[PDB]
Amino acid sequence: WTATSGSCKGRCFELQEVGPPDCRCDNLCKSYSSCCHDFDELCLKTARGWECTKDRCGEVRNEENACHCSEDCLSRGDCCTNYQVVCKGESHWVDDDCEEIKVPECPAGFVRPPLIIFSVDGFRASYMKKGSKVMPNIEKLRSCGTHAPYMRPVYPTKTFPNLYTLATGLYPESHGIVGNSMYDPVFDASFHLRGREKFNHRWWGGQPLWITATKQGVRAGTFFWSVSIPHERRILTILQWLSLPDNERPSVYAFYSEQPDFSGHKYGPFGPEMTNPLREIDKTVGQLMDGLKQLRLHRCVNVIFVGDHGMEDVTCDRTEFLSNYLTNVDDITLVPGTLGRIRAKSINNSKYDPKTIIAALTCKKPDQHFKPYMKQHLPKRLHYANNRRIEDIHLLVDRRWHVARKPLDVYKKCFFQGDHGFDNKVNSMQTVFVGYGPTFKYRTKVPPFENIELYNVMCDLLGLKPAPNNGTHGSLNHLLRTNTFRPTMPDEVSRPNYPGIMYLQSEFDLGCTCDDKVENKLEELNKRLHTKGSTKERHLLYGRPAVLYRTSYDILYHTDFESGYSEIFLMPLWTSYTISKQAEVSSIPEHLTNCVRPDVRVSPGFSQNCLAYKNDKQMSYGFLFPPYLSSSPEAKYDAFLVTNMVPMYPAFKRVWAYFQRVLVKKYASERNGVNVISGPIFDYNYDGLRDTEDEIKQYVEGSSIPVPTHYYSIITSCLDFTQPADKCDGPLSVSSFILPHRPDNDESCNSSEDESKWVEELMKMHTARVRDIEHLTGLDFYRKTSRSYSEILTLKTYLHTYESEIGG
Ligand SMILES: *[C@@H]1O[C@H](CO)[C@@H](O[C@@H]2O[C@H](CO)[C@@H](O[C@@H]3O[C@H](CO[C@H]4O[C@H](CO)[C@@H](O)[C@H](O[C@H]5O[C@H](CO)[C@@H](O)[C@H](O)[C@@H]5O[C@H]5O[C@H](CO)[C@@H](O)[C@H](O)[C@@H]5O)[C@@H]4O)[C@@H](O)[C@H](O[C@H]4O[C@H](CO)[C@@H](O)[C@H](O)[C@@H]4O[C@H]4O[C@H](CO)[C@@H](O)[C@H](O)[C@@H]4O)[C@@H]3O)[C@H](O)[C@H]2NC(C)=O)[C@H](O)[C@H]1NC(C)=O
Ligand SMILES: CNC(=O)c1nc(N2CNc3cc(OC)c(OC)cc32)sc1-c1ccc(Cl)cc1
Ligand SMILES: [Ca+2]
Ligand SMILES: [Cl-]
Ligand code: NA
Ligand SMILES: [Zn+2]
């Protein structure tokens, strides 16, 4: 109930929300069916349109008019946005030369430059270049301000997850908005685009920018606009609020456009009908900037022009149907479209089995346009698992395709030519970022970055302390002229031991053998030097990784590699080695095929044992530093140390072997040498975070050897590839991956072929940021470089996507 009898007189677009059933006059009241009776008449005036004309200049104020052209309008804050152009001979903002904004140029009583976020739905990154002819206002913001060639959204690349990720800095699994449609089993409640459930606060976790601001004494405009408020009125309202007295005036505002997404769905991302919505958005930017200039705020306000996701060509005839795969199609609920999420239609059905569902969906047709995953097996870069609203079964749908349950769902539940939602590394899902204002840099292009990073910057722009979030604060300092945040490196928590020779071979009863008793101060001094670290500067190029949790571990030096060996997990946390452009690949000698060697620096009690692997019929082992890349025959023995061994399924060893034998060398030739850091990851509860020992669900049979869920590698070289990786004077270049450690290669439909046809494709899907590895391991990398720490943060957030170059 709302007592709609009260009145909006002097309350139009009020900022505090009045508690029901007092009637509302704020910008969301329509959405709630709760506006006062006179809201439309008073607050949504439209008479005369939105532009001054020659003949309105100096008019006597008529309060009925949508906006005013009278002499008093500047100080009332309510002129048409083009008032000074038409009536005072001023130029439009877009017609002015751009001029660096070195300092904020703000009216008196402004305590900080205000922030205005101009968010546009479905604004695909290539529109910046492809529509530049019809968007001069946007083009000027882009060329004069700071811009990225594109910005990466979060998965899924849908509106509500991205809007709220923008607002909170959090992955959808943490903020809770995991799709446009959701079921929460604990509330037994459903969230949908249409309807009132979406308004319930329980869906929205984390702390969005407006709440962060409010809590810290920074006033915020109300960010959300009822759909029937036209864009012109949204702009005028923001501008009116900007005229409030100092003590009442917000410092942060949002405008939202439903375009170009809306037309994009109907016409496709480059339909000829798309020119007009792009022109109209640009005109709205024009209105805002002319309005700021009238208020003398165009060199005072920071403006962020930001999209949520792009748009791809998708039509009804590119739909896959679960009914062509599944026998019991009516025993499941599917969330359909550009992703698939599956659960049991009823919780009382105990004949529901995920494994059989996954199998009926795995590599079943030649050209299959979606791939089933249990959510914990999805690419860790998606961070899409640790939420009860995300169904255990997931379908990653190929770009340009839909998945649906049955053909009737598509003609009774074609109409559309565009959609979005696909994997966030897909080129057509990329969106835009432009920052313009005193706090942003002048004419600066910055590399592509992820939208999870912006909450921190928005907080920096307003002098706020960000709530805890998934951005890496400092990684976007390079976008800013001032207000940079200067983070410190985290402190190391555990210091390593440096064990020397402490154990005789006969103390080890591990059931391991090696044909190695097949052996002076020429070499005998040289080996001692190598075991004490004489080559460490070659193989440990950026310092040792720091351990940021309490544990017991040893540093182990070798000719060809250095490792941080965990006495708790019985394997290295990391293994670091450098392969130059010139290194050669050898094979494992025949006599060394099953060789494993006790490490006389590390006790029997803290070593793996070969017998466990022998007894465990599912589990084999591999090596972290690869024997194929040994610098010499003698050095090769080091690679067979029990301390360099890790458990691997035979199916995974196919992947790992090819990476270590073929691919490391390939990257060293292409990148002029590479440094590799590899190790295990344990994330049994799929939370993206390092497991403690008591969270491990699988061990090598009969032992306390924990089985990794994933293996990572970080591959660093010199960004200027004319310099070798081990003598790099400047910026670095990185790619990383987090490969799932799976007992089968079901994920790879072409796996029965030779690894040269399928392994590299798998590795690309599981591309990762260094930061994702840090969360997963409790390690901090790149602690000793010659680079600034902010630059290194930006490196750690880098994602190598393998997409072709954005454009054409
Ligand atoms: C991305 O950035 C974020 C933000 O930093 C990272 O997420 C944080 O991770 C923290 C560490 O894991 C986690 O800390 C826990 O908080 C618990 C208190 O939780 C509430 O309070 C906070 C504070 O305001 C709030 O933000 C939380 O919000 C979550 O839940 C609400 C309501 O359900 C949702 O609205 C919201 O969406 C959010 O959900 C997300 O997080 C929860 C987990 O908190 C998930 O379950 C959801 O799926 C979703 O992802 C909460 O309202 C606190 O109780 C925890 O403490 C336990 O564990 C510690 C170990 O040190 C121990 O000291 C305690 O004993 C305690 O154990 C007890 O509970 C256990 C579980 O029931 C039980 O097993 C034990 O036996 C004990 O009884 C813990 O400190 C933090 O809450 C989240 N924050 C957010 C916003 O998600 C995220 O990790 C980052 N991701 C990556 C990849 O880096
Ligand atoms: C992709 N979108 C956004 O990021 C976004 N959208 C907004 N509005 C405002 N009014 C509105 C009405 C809608 O429906 C009518 C709507 O539907 C989906 C969305 C919105 S505000 C905003 C935003 C602005 C700043 C920050 Cl920090 C975070 C988010
Ligand atoms: Ca974990
Ligand atoms: Cl969804
Ligand atoms: Na075995
Ligand atoms: Zn859309």
Key attributes of the depicted protein:
808 residues, alpha+beta, Extracellular Endonuclease, Chain A, seven-stranded mixed β-sheet, seven-stranded antiparallel β-sheet, globular, binds a molecule of 8 linked components (NAG-NAG-BMA-MAN-MAN-MAN-MAN-MAN), binds ligand XJK, binds calcium ion, binds chloride ion, hydrolase, lysophosphatidic acid, LPA, lysophosphatidylcholine
Summed up, what is this model?
The protein is of the alpha+beta class and 808 residues long. The chain is globular and about 105 Å long.
**Classification by helices and strands:** alpha+beta
CATH topology of the domain at 505-797: Extracellular Endonuclease, Chain A
Could you estimate the helical fraction of the residues in percent? 10-25%
The name of the CATH superfamily of the domain at 505-797 reads Extracellular Endonuclease, subunit A
Please state the CA-atom Rg, rounded to the nearest Å: 30 Å
With helices defined by DSSP (H or I, 4 residues minimum), what is the helix count?
22
- Which word captures the global form? globular
The CATH class label of the domain at 505-797 is Alpha Beta
Q: How many strand units?
A: 28
Strand content: 15-25%
CATH architecture grouping of the domain at 505-797: 3-Layer(aba) Sandwich
How far the N terminus sits from the C terminus, by CA atoms, comes to: 55 Å
What small molecules does the structure contain?
Answer: a molecule of 8 linked components (NAG-NAG-BMA-MAN-MAN-MAN-MAN-MAN), the ligand CNC(=O)c1nc(N2CNc3cc(OC)c(OC)cc32)sc1-c1ccc(Cl)cc1, calcium ion, chloride ion, sodium ion, zinc ion
What does the largest sheet look like?
A: 7 strands, mixed
PDB class: hydrolase
Keywords: hydrolase, LPA, lysophosphatidylcholine, LPC, somatomedin, metastasis, vascular development, neural development
Assembly: monomeric
Entry title: Crystal Structure of rat Autotaxin in complex with 5-(4-chlorophenyl)-2-(5,6-dimethoxybenzimidazol-1-yl)-N-methyl-1,3-thiazole-4-carboxamide, i.e. SMILES C1(=NC(=C(S1)c1ccc(cc1)Cl)C(=O)NC)N1c2c(N=C1)cc(c(c2)OC)OC with IC50=0.0108616 microM
